Coordinates of C-alpha atoms in Angstrom, one line a residue:
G1 CA -10.3 14.2 -3.6
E2 CA -13.7 15.1 -5.1
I3 CA -15.7 13.6 -8.1
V4 CA -16.5 17.0 -9.9
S5 CA -18.6 15.3 -12.8
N6 CA -20.5 12.2 -13.6
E7 CA -22.3 11.0 -16.8
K8 CA -22.7 8.0 -19.2
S9 CA -19.5 7.3 -20.4
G10 CA -20.3 5.4 -23.9
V11 CA -18.8 1.8 -22.6
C12 CA -20.2 -0.9 -20.4
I13 CA -18.1 -2.1 -17.4
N14 CA -19.1 -5.7 -16.7
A15 CA -20.8 -6.4 -13.3
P16 CA -18.6 -8.2 -11.0
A17 CA -18.7 -12.1 -10.4
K18 CA -19.7 -13.2 -7.1
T19 CA -17.0 -13.0 -4.5
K20 CA -14.1 -16.1 -4.9
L21 CA -14.0 -16.3 -1.0
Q22 CA -15.5 -19.2 0.6
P23 CA -15.3 -20.6 4.0
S24 CA -12.1 -22.9 4.1
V25 CA -11.6 -26.1 6.1
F26 CA -10.5 -23.9 9.1
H27 CA -13.7 -21.8 9.6
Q28 CA -14.8 -23.3 12.5
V29 CA -11.2 -24.3 14.1
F30 CA -10.5 -20.4 14.4
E31 CA -12.3 -17.4 15.8
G32 CA -13.0 -14.6 13.4
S33 CA -15.6 -12.3 12.2
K34 CA -14.5 -10.9 8.9
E35 CA -16.6 -11.6 5.6
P36 CA -16.0 -11.0 2.0
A37 CA -16.6 -7.6 0.9
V38 CA -19.9 -6.2 -0.4
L39 CA -19.6 -6.6 -4.3
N40 CA -22.9 -5.5 -5.7
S41 CA -25.7 -3.1 -4.3
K42 CA -28.3 -6.3 -4.0
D43 CA -25.9 -7.8 -1.2
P44 CA -28.6 -8.6 1.6
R45 CA -25.9 -8.2 4.2
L46 CA -26.1 -4.1 3.4
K47 CA -27.7 -1.8 6.0
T48 CA -27.2 1.1 3.8
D49 CA -26.7 2.2 0.0
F50 CA -24.0 0.7 -1.9
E51 CA -22.8 3.0 -4.2
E52 CA -22.7 5.8 -1.7
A53 CA -20.9 3.8 1.0
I54 CA -17.9 3.1 -1.9
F55 CA -17.7 6.7 -3.1
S56 CA -17.9 8.0 0.3
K57 CA -14.1 8.2 0.6
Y58 CA -14.0 11.3 -1.4
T59 CA -14.2 13.9 1.2
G60 CA -13.5 17.0 -1.3
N61 CA -10.5 19.0 -1.5
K62 CA -8.6 21.8 0.4
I63 CA -8.1 23.9 -2.6
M64 CA -4.8 26.2 -1.9
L65 CA -1.7 27.5 -3.1
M66 CA 1.2 25.5 -1.9
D67 CA 2.1 27.2 1.6
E68 CA 5.6 28.2 3.3
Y69 CA 5.6 24.8 5.3
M70 CA 5.3 22.9 2.2
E71 CA 8.1 24.4 0.6
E72 CA 10.4 23.8 3.1
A73 CA 9.4 20.0 3.8
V74 CA 9.6 19.9 -0.3
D75 CA 13.2 21.2 -0.1
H76 CA 14.3 18.8 3.1
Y77 CA 12.9 15.8 1.6
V78 CA 14.8 16.3 -1.7
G79 CA 17.8 16.8 0.4
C80 CA 17.3 13.3 1.8
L81 CA 16.7 12.1 -1.6
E82 CA 20.1 13.3 -3.4
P83 CA 22.4 11.3 -1.9
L84 CA 20.7 8.2 -3.7
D85 CA 21.4 9.9 -7.3
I86 CA 18.3 8.8 -9.1
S87 CA 18.6 9.0 -12.5
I88 CA 15.8 10.9 -14.3
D89 CA 16.5 9.0 -17.8
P90 CA 13.8 6.7 -18.8
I91 CA 14.5 2.8 -18.8
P92 CA 14.1 0.8 -22.0
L93 CA 10.7 -0.3 -22.6
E94 CA 11.9 -3.9 -22.4
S95 CA 12.9 -3.3 -18.7
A96 CA 9.6 -1.7 -17.9
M97 CA 7.5 -4.7 -19.5
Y98 CA 9.9 -7.7 -18.2
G99 CA 12.0 -6.1 -15.3
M100 CA 15.3 -5.0 -13.9
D101 CA 17.3 -4.6 -11.0
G102 CA 14.8 -2.8 -8.4
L103 CA 11.8 -3.2 -10.7
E104 CA 9.8 -6.3 -11.0
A105 CA 8.4 -7.6 -14.3
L106 CA 4.9 -6.0 -15.1
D107 CA 2.3 -8.0 -13.1
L108 CA 0.5 -10.0 -15.8
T109 CA -2.6 -11.1 -13.2
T110 CA -4.0 -7.4 -13.1
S111 CA -6.6 -5.8 -15.7
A112 CA -5.2 -4.6 -18.8
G113 CA -7.7 -1.9 -18.4
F114 CA -9.0 0.2 -20.8
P115 CA -9.6 -0.3 -23.9
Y116 CA -8.2 -3.8 -23.9
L117 CA -10.7 -5.2 -21.2
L118 CA -13.5 -4.4 -23.3
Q119 CA -12.0 -5.6 -26.7
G120 CA -10.8 -9.4 -25.5
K121 CA -7.2 -8.1 -25.7
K122 CA -5.3 -9.9 -22.8
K123 CA -1.7 -8.9 -21.2
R124 CA -1.1 -12.4 -22.1
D125 CA -1.4 -11.6 -25.9
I126 CA 0.8 -8.6 -25.7
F127 CA 3.4 -10.2 -23.4
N128 CA 6.0 -12.7 -24.1
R129 CA 8.4 -13.1 -21.1
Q130 CA 10.3 -15.6 -23.1
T131 CA 11.2 -13.7 -25.9
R132 CA 11.0 -10.2 -24.1
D133 CA 9.1 -8.6 -27.2
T134 CA 8.3 -5.2 -26.8
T135 CA 7.0 -4.8 -30.6
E136 CA 3.4 -5.6 -29.6
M137 CA 3.1 -3.0 -26.7
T138 CA 4.9 -0.4 -29.1
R139 CA 2.2 -0.7 -31.4
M140 CA -0.5 -0.6 -28.8
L141 CA 0.9 2.6 -27.4
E142 CA 1.1 4.1 -30.9
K143 CA -2.4 3.0 -31.0
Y144 CA -4.2 4.3 -28.1
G145 CA -1.5 6.4 -26.6
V146 CA -1.8 7.4 -23.1
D147 CA -3.8 9.5 -20.4
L148 CA -6.4 6.8 -20.8
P149 CA -9.2 6.3 -18.0
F150 CA -9.1 4.1 -14.9
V151 CA -11.4 1.2 -14.9
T152 CA -13.2 1.0 -11.4
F153 CA -13.7 -2.7 -9.9
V154 CA -15.1 -3.4 -6.2
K155 CA -12.1 -5.3 -4.6
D156 CA -12.8 -8.8 -3.5
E157 CA -11.4 -9.1 0.1
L158 CA -12.2 -9.8 3.2
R159 CA -13.6 -7.1 5.4
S160 CA -14.6 -6.6 9.2
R161 CA -18.6 -7.2 9.6
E162 CA -19.1 -3.6 10.4
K163 CA -17.5 -2.5 7.2
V164 CA -19.6 -5.6 5.3
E165 CA -22.9 -3.9 6.5
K166 CA -21.7 -0.3 6.1
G167 CA -20.9 -1.3 2.6
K168 CA -17.3 0.3 2.9
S169 CA -15.8 -1.7 0.3
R170 CA -12.7 -0.6 -1.3
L171 CA -12.2 -0.1 -5.0
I172 CA -9.5 -1.0 -7.7
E173 CA -8.8 2.1 -9.7
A174 CA -7.0 0.1 -12.4
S175 CA -4.6 1.9 -15.0
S176 CA -4.6 1.1 -18.9
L177 CA -1.6 -1.3 -19.4
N178 CA -0.3 1.9 -21.6
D179 CA -0.4 4.2 -18.7
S180 CA 1.3 1.5 -16.4
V181 CA 4.0 1.0 -18.8
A182 CA 4.8 4.8 -19.8
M183 CA 5.0 5.6 -16.2
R184 CA 7.5 2.6 -15.8
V185 CA 9.5 3.9 -18.7
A186 CA 9.6 7.4 -17.4
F187 CA 9.9 6.8 -13.4
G188 CA 11.4 2.9 -13.7
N189 CA 15.3 4.3 -12.1
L190 CA 13.1 6.1 -9.5
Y191 CA 10.9 3.0 -8.3
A192 CA 14.3 1.0 -8.5
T193 CA 16.2 3.2 -6.5
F194 CA 13.0 3.3 -3.9
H195 CA 12.8 -0.6 -3.9
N196 CA 16.5 -1.1 -3.6
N197 CA 17.0 1.7 -0.4
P198 CA 14.1 1.2 1.9
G199 CA 14.9 3.2 4.8
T200 CA 15.0 6.7 6.2
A201 CA 16.6 8.4 2.8
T202 CA 13.9 7.5 0.7
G203 CA 11.4 7.6 3.9
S204 CA 10.1 4.3 2.4
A205 CA 9.5 0.7 3.2
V206 CA 7.7 -0.3 -0.5
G207 CA 9.2 -3.6 -1.5
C208 CA 10.9 -4.3 1.8
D209 CA 11.3 -7.7 3.5
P210 CA 10.0 -7.6 7.1
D211 CA 11.8 -10.6 8.0
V212 CA 15.3 -8.5 7.6
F213 CA 14.0 -4.9 7.5
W214 CA 12.4 -4.9 10.9
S215 CA 15.9 -5.2 12.6
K216 CA 17.0 -1.9 10.8
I217 CA 14.1 0.0 11.8
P218 CA 14.7 0.8 15.3
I219 CA 18.2 1.8 14.6
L220 CA 17.4 4.2 12.0
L221 CA 14.6 5.6 14.1
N222 CA 16.6 5.8 17.1
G223 CA 14.9 8.8 18.8
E224 CA 11.5 9.4 20.3
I225 CA 9.4 7.8 18.0
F226 CA 5.9 8.5 16.5
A227 CA 3.4 6.9 14.4
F228 CA 0.1 7.5 12.3
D229 CA -2.7 5.9 10.9
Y230 CA -5.3 7.6 8.3
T231 CA -8.5 7.6 7.3
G232 CA -9.0 7.3 3.6
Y233 CA -5.6 8.6 3.0
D234 CA -5.8 8.1 -0.8
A235 CA -9.1 9.7 -1.4
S236 CA -8.3 12.3 0.9
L237 CA -5.3 13.7 -0.7
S238 CA -5.8 17.5 -2.2
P239 CA -4.4 18.6 -5.8
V240 CA -1.8 20.9 -3.3
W241 CA -0.1 17.6 -2.2
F242 CA 0.0 16.4 -6.0
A243 CA 1.8 19.8 -6.4
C244 CA 4.2 19.3 -3.7
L245 CA 5.3 15.9 -5.3
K246 CA 5.6 17.6 -8.7
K247 CA 8.0 20.0 -7.1
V248 CA 10.1 17.2 -5.7
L249 CA 10.2 15.7 -9.2
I250 CA 11.2 18.8 -10.6
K251 CA 14.0 19.4 -8.2
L252 CA 15.4 15.7 -8.9
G253 CA 15.7 17.2 -12.3
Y254 CA 12.6 15.5 -13.9
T255 CA 10.4 18.1 -16.3
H256 CA 7.8 17.2 -18.5
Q257 CA 7.3 13.8 -16.5
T258 CA 5.2 15.8 -13.9
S259 CA 2.6 15.2 -16.5
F260 CA 2.2 11.7 -15.1
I261 CA 1.1 13.3 -12.0
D262 CA -1.7 15.3 -13.5
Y263 CA -2.5 12.3 -14.6
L264 CA -3.1 10.9 -10.9
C265 CA -4.3 14.2 -9.5
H266 CA -7.1 14.9 -12.2
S267 CA -8.2 11.4 -13.4
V268 CA -11.5 9.9 -15.2
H269 CA -12.8 6.6 -14.1
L270 CA -14.9 4.2 -15.7
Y271 CA -17.8 2.1 -13.7
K272 CA -21.1 0.5 -15.1
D273 CA -22.1 2.7 -17.9
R274 CA -20.7 5.7 -16.2
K275 CA -17.6 8.2 -16.5
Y276 CA -16.8 10.0 -13.4
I277 CA -13.8 12.5 -13.1
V278 CA -12.0 12.7 -9.9
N279 CA -9.8 16.1 -8.7
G280 CA -7.5 15.1 -6.2
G281 CA -7.4 11.6 -4.5
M282 CA -4.6 8.8 -5.7
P283 CA -5.9 6.3 -7.9
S284 CA -5.4 2.7 -6.1
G285 CA -4.2 0.7 -9.2
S286 CA -1.6 3.1 -10.8
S287 CA 1.8 1.9 -11.7
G288 CA 3.4 4.2 -9.2
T289 CA 0.4 4.5 -6.6
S290 CA 2.6 2.8 -3.8
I291 CA 5.8 4.9 -4.3
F292 CA 4.2 8.4 -5.0
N293 CA 1.6 7.9 -1.7
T294 CA 4.9 7.4 0.1
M295 CA 6.6 10.3 -1.2
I296 CA 3.6 12.4 -0.6
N297 CA 3.5 11.1 3.0
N298 CA 7.0 12.3 3.5
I299 CA 6.4 15.7 2.4
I300 CA 3.1 15.8 4.7
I301 CA 4.8 14.5 7.9
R302 CA 7.4 17.3 7.6
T303 CA 5.0 19.9 6.6
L304 CA 2.9 19.3 9.8
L305 CA 5.8 19.1 12.1
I306 CA 7.4 22.4 10.7
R307 CA 3.9 24.0 10.9
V308 CA 3.2 22.8 14.4
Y309 CA 6.7 23.6 15.8
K310 CA 9.1 26.7 15.6
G311 CA 12.5 25.7 15.8
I312 CA 12.2 22.3 14.3
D313 CA 15.2 20.9 12.9
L314 CA 14.3 18.3 10.2
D315 CA 17.9 17.1 9.6
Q316 CA 16.9 15.0 13.1
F317 CA 13.5 14.1 12.1
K318 CA 13.8 10.6 10.4
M319 CA 10.8 8.4 8.9
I320 CA 9.5 5.6 7.2
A321 CA 6.2 5.2 5.3
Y322 CA 4.4 2.6 3.3
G323 CA 1.7 4.9 1.6
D324 CA -0.5 6.0 4.4
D325 CA 1.1 4.0 6.9
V326 CA 4.0 5.8 8.9
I327 CA 6.7 5.4 11.6
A328 CA 9.0 8.4 12.8
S329 CA 11.4 9.8 15.0
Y330 CA 12.4 13.0 16.7
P331 CA 15.2 13.4 19.1
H332 CA 12.6 15.1 21.5
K333 CA 9.2 14.3 22.6
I334 CA 6.2 15.9 20.3
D335 CA 2.7 15.8 20.6
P336 CA 1.5 13.9 17.3
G337 CA -2.0 14.8 18.4
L338 CA -0.9 18.7 17.6
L339 CA 0.2 17.2 13.9
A340 CA -2.9 15.5 13.6
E341 CA -5.2 18.7 14.3
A342 CA -2.8 20.2 11.7
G343 CA -3.3 17.5 9.3
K344 CA -7.1 18.7 9.7
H345 CA -6.1 21.9 8.1
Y346 CA -5.0 20.4 4.8
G347 CA -8.4 18.0 4.5
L348 CA -6.4 15.0 5.9
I349 CA -7.7 12.6 8.7
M350 CA -5.1 11.1 10.9
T351 CA -4.7 9.4 14.2
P352 CA -1.6 9.1 16.3
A353 CA -0.6 5.7 17.8
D354 CA -0.6 7.9 21.1
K355 CA -4.2 8.4 21.9
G356 CA -3.5 10.7 24.8
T357 CA -2.0 11.9 27.9
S358 CA -3.4 8.8 29.8
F359 CA -2.2 6.5 27.3
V360 CA 1.3 4.9 27.4
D361 CA 3.8 6.9 25.2
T362 CA 4.2 5.1 21.9
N363 CA 7.1 2.6 22.2
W364 CA 8.9 -0.4 20.3
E365 CA 6.8 -2.6 22.2
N366 CA 3.5 -1.0 21.2
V367 CA 4.2 0.5 17.9
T368 CA 2.8 -1.2 14.6
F369 CA 3.8 -1.0 10.9
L370 CA 2.5 -2.9 7.9
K371 CA 0.1 -4.3 10.7
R372 CA 2.8 -5.7 12.3
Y373 CA 4.5 -5.2 15.9
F374 CA 8.1 -5.2 16.9
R375 CA 9.4 -8.0 19.1
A376 CA 13.4 -8.2 20.0
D377 CA 14.6 -11.8 19.8
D378 CA 15.2 -13.5 23.4
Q379 CA 18.5 -15.1 22.3
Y380 CA 19.6 -12.0 20.0
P381 CA 17.8 -8.9 21.1
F382 CA 19.5 -6.6 18.4
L383 CA 17.6 -8.8 15.9
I384 CA 13.8 -7.6 15.9
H385 CA 10.6 -9.9 14.8
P386 CA 8.0 -8.6 12.7
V387 CA 4.9 -9.9 14.4
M388 CA 1.8 -10.2 12.5
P389 CA -1.1 -10.4 15.3
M390 CA -2.4 -14.0 15.4
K391 CA -6.0 -12.2 14.9
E392 CA -5.0 -11.2 11.7
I393 CA -3.5 -14.6 10.8
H394 CA -6.7 -16.1 12.5
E395 CA -9.3 -14.2 10.4
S396 CA -7.3 -15.0 7.1
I397 CA -7.0 -18.8 7.7
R398 CA -10.6 -19.3 7.8
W399 CA -11.3 -18.4 3.9
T400 CA -9.8 -19.4 0.7
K401 CA -10.6 -18.3 -2.8
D402 CA -9.1 -21.7 -3.8
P403 CA -9.2 -24.8 -1.5
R404 CA -6.6 -26.2 -3.9
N405 CA -3.9 -23.8 -2.7
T406 CA -4.5 -24.5 1.0
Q407 CA -1.0 -26.0 1.6
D408 CA 0.6 -23.0 0.1
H409 CA -1.5 -20.6 1.8
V410 CA -1.1 -22.3 5.3
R411 CA 3.1 -22.5 4.7
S412 CA 2.9 -18.6 3.8
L413 CA 0.7 -18.1 7.1
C414 CA 3.2 -20.2 8.9
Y415 CA 6.3 -17.9 7.9
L416 CA 4.2 -15.2 9.4
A417 CA 2.7 -16.7 12.7
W418 CA 6.2 -18.5 14.0
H419 CA 7.3 -14.6 15.0
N420 CA 4.7 -15.0 17.8
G421 CA 7.1 -17.3 19.6
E422 CA 7.4 -21.1 19.7
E423 CA 4.1 -21.4 22.4
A424 CA 1.9 -19.6 20.1
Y425 CA 3.2 -21.4 17.0
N426 CA 2.8 -24.8 18.4
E427 CA -0.9 -23.9 19.5
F428 CA -1.6 -22.5 16.0
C429 CA -0.2 -25.7 14.3
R430 CA -2.1 -28.0 16.7
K431 CA -5.1 -26.3 15.7
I432 CA -4.4 -26.6 11.9
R433 CA -4.1 -30.2 12.9
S434 CA -7.5 -30.5 14.7
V435 CA -9.0 -31.1 11.2
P436 CA -8.6 -33.9 8.4
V437 CA -6.6 -31.6 5.5
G438 CA -4.8 -29.8 8.4
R439 CA -3.7 -33.0 9.9
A440 CA -2.3 -34.3 6.3
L441 CA -0.2 -30.8 5.5
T442 CA 3.4 -30.4 5.5
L443 CA 4.3 -27.4 8.3
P444 CA 7.5 -25.9 8.8
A445 CA 9.2 -26.7 12.2
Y446 CA 9.7 -23.9 14.4
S447 CA 13.4 -24.8 14.6
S448 CA 13.6 -24.4 10.6
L449 CA 11.8 -21.5 10.4
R450 CA 14.1 -19.8 13.3
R451 CA 17.3 -21.1 11.4
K452 CA 15.9 -19.8 8.0
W453 CA 15.2 -16.4 9.5
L454 CA 18.8 -16.1 11.5
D455 CA 20.3 -16.9 7.8
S456 CA 18.4 -14.1 6.2
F457 CA 21.0 -11.8 7.3

């Protein structure tokens, strides 16, 4: 991705509020070093220029025609998708706004974006879930159309101490409610198909339930596994990868709907009083951001495999991705480091889980996905615990955006934590109850959690 122009826009995107994050009643009880992201350039924690830092994710583009390895990757991926019988038919506006099977009702909490945020028009004013009214969205669509700009927000979240002082905060590139809606209309069935079929056909884990989906993963990826982490995946994508995605959609039968991919490839953004235009780079806050990032990763990993290895039979290849995050399988061992170098050639920055010949081979004990490790249950080793590292839970519990939601926050953390085993979970509950409000909280018994877990299947 590359910013190809920058100028005064004509509008004024309001400065962000101060962080909503503050030390929770557990800040002292648990170890951790993350802090709320820098949100403005006058943050005293910064040790470099904020603006430069936040837009540095755009590394440039590898401009190129689609190559032969890409054409093969696209064909194999389409072949994988075809048994799913994705419908290319639009879904009704009502379903796009209020939901259907496989597609959740449109998120009411995220910004309505442009022009609405500058006009005091809120999603609430347009949406009525009680009556499922589409009339006030239909006129807004008629009024402003689609292909509207994205509004840039800096993301209010925890970040490592290094990223705070390096100013590496993340950005939300929020699409207009018009574009979200039109894209959901056009791609609604595809999204639903993906949500309903996490696995190695979609090659997608978007919308999955780790509690239950984890036991499936080792069965789907039953060969010699490998995994990647990317640096700046989204912003690093070159237009050529968006072109491969369009070819996949075309081969599924879509036609004019590739216009929606151009809208993601070549995007115009609003930040402060500026309009800047980005070629390449997936926007973070679009309707199909996750699904399309995932579809593109399916194309990428195949492309790198075929490029590096002559005599690769992709029908033996399996993978599951969630955006940049990937875990994959091939029956024979490969050198993921070779694929990563190959990725360089297309302007990608990737690190394999296997860091070298001296490191232990990636296996089900050391591999991660969605930040989680994999651990076979003692009693039932065919059932796989998703294991969020306690370090992550420790970092999260030390802050809240709203102290009045401590009970809900901690409960959801417990549903994560207990997979680390009974002893780690007892220690965790004990530390929670080493402080007044913690001692008052309701906390799931280890027994109940395991029982609930067991009966999710």
